[PDB]
Amino acid sequence: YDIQAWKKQCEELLNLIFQCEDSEPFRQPVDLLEYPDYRDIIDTPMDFATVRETLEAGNYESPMELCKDVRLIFSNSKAYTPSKRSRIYSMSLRLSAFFEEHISSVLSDYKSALRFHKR
């Protein structure tokens, strides 16, 4: 029932994501010199360094907010992909599966702790 435990759990999960080779295209903001029309398709760019910085700055109130930003990394990749003949979207799908598998208990424990706090 520790209401703050999610933060270190998210830091550790981000460390695992950064070691994973599948995170390579998503570790830093998309380079507009490489993808000049990126902002014509994507309204809100997101990447794992921005998520980590937001977490470390104390600018996430809950793991649900962090989840929403990580999911935006994957939705942006899906929206920008021209087709399955894209290694980057395929990497996003595997990385998304890995993230969802690990974030499930973080969200459940946090929501349970908050329900206990407000009992």
In 3D space, the residue among 119, 74, 76 whose CA is nearest the CA of residue 94 turns out to be 74
Does the protein bind ligand UWG through residue 88 (CB under 6 A)? yes
Site residues for ligand UWG, window 31-50 (CB under 6 A)? 35
Binding residue for ligand UWG, selected from 25, 62, 102, 114, defined by CB under 6 A:
25
Q: Which is nearer to ligand UWG, 17 or 106 (CB)?
A: 17
Does the protein bind ligand UWG through residue 77 (CB under 6 A)? yes
Binding residue for ligand UWG, selected from 6, 26, 99, 110, defined by CB under 6 A:
26
Question: How many Å apart are CA 5 and CA 81, to the nearest integer?
Answer: 36
Q: Which is nearer to ligand UWG, 60 or 89 (CB)?
A: 89
Pull the structure tokens for residue 85: 């003949």
Does the protein bind ligand UWG through residue 75 (CB under 6 A)? no
Does the protein bind ligand UWG through residue 72 (CB under 6 A)? no
Q: How far is CA 43 from CA 38, 40, 63, 78, 117, in A?
A: 9, 7, 23, 13, 37
Does the protein bind ligand UWG through residue 81 (CB under 6 A)? yes
